[PDB]
Design a protein around this ligand. Structure first.
Ligand SMILES: *CC1=CN(c2ncnc3nc[nH]c23)[C@H]2C[C@@H]1C(C=O)=CO2
Length: 367
């Protein structure tokens, strides 16, 4: 099942003409992984374009960010051009107008990529921060964060590069078995996700899952040490794996113990960035796009962690049941932005208000 990319074009900071800024093209929710993204200045490709490394979501969808340094010109027209399997022709999008932590590791396999993209990639994350990276082209596990490279001995990288070289071969072999079993030809994707969550109160959560072509394939239940299979093909794989009772017990123990221990270790190594809280800056704007149309936009920016809650209240008593919302977007500098717009009443004002909650801070912008 293919999924088409969600393309969102926006600036890192609120845009004002003549002031340098960063243009973002957040490309998310797409499957398979192969994509081509360009940023266009007045219809022309931009030579210097930065982009985060390929990232992975828990729904098996892929996400990325493309950014470039620019200064907004009232005349300049910036847009983002995306190529994907689901797009018979490129799609151009104009630029209009904490306490819970998680460690998780993903494995990605692509058969017949026919690209300068690796056959196998594996990335680790603490709270949406890539801590480590490994791929088949590199054949080496390298820290993706600086706080990870200043606390782990070089032997640690050697030891786990050996595990990842073996896991890579297993993924290549396991992927062929699935294509033969399904009689599939061409490029297909194999995905794995393992991780644990450490809640504020001390509770722990764990998960291990496999996906074939972006669809749930095998789900490990660590409470019953069973692999749940979606298909009869997955059932065949389930039977092979469930033979090795030792492997299953290791999964339970790695999730409940080693994973949380690793996570606590990392949350200290990166305490400066991971335990950081940046409060949001909220401004209310009034816009009249058409005659007799007025809307209020509660816009928040520069906060971390991305967990935020925004709402509008008519007369300061009850919530509005017609509130449009904006996605929480990565601005590119480690902070996040969002917005919430309501249609201003043509009648006499109800004295609307905006309410923002972020990490225990409550802001009310009564206008
Ligand atoms: C870097 C490491 C990754 N780890 C890991 N465990 C299970 N499945 C994985 N898939 C990719 N990487 C996986 C382990 C060992 C090692 C580590 C510390 O650096 C934590 O967890």
């Amino acid at each position: 099942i293919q999924r088409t990319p969600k393309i969102q074009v926006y600036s890192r900071h609120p845009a004002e003409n003549g002031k340098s800024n960063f243009l973002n093209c957040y490309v998310s929710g797409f499957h398979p992984s192969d994509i081509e993204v360009d940023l266009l200045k007045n219809g022309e490709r931009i030579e210097k374009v930065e982009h985060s490394d390929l990232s992975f979501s828990k729904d098996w969808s892929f996400y990325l960010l493309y950014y470039t340094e620019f200064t907004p010109t009232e005349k300049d027209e910036y847009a983002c051009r995306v190529n994907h399997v689901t797009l018979s022709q490129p799609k151009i999008v104009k630029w209009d107008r904490e306490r819970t932590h998680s460690l998780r590791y993903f494995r990605l396999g692509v058969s017949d990529p026919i690209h300068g993209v690796p056959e196998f990639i594996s990335v680790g994350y603490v709270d949406s921060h890539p801590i480590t990276t490994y791929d088949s082209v590199t054949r080496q596990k390298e820290p993706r964060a600086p706080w990870m490279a200043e606390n782990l001995a070089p032997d640690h990288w050697e030891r786990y590069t050996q595990l990842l070289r073996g896991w890579q071969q297993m993924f290549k072999v396991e992927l062929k078995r699935l294509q033969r079993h399904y009689n599939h030809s061409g490029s297909h994707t194999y995905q794995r996700m393992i991780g644990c969550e450490l809640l504020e109160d001390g509770s722990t959560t764990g998960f291990l899952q496999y996906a074939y072509d972006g669809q749930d394939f095998l789900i490990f239940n660590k409470d019953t040490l069973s692999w749940l299979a979606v298909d009869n093909v997955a059932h065949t794989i389930k039977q092979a794996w469930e033979a090795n009772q030792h492997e299953l017990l290791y999964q339970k123990n790695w999730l409940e113990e080693e994973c949380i221990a690793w996570l606590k270790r990392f949350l200290e190594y990166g305490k400066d960035t991971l335990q950081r809280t940046e409060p949001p800056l909220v401004r209310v704007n009034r816009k009249e796009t058409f005659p007799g149309v007025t809307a209020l936009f509660c816009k928040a920016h520069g906060f971390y962690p991305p967990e935020i809650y925004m709402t509008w209240m008519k007369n300061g008593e009850e919530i509005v049941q017609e509130i449009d919302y904006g996605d929480i977007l990565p601005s590119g500098d480690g902070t996040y932005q969002a917005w919430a717009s309501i249609e201003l009443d043509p009648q006499s004002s109800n004295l609307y208000s905006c309410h923002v909650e972020h990490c225990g801070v409550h802001m009310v912008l009564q206008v």
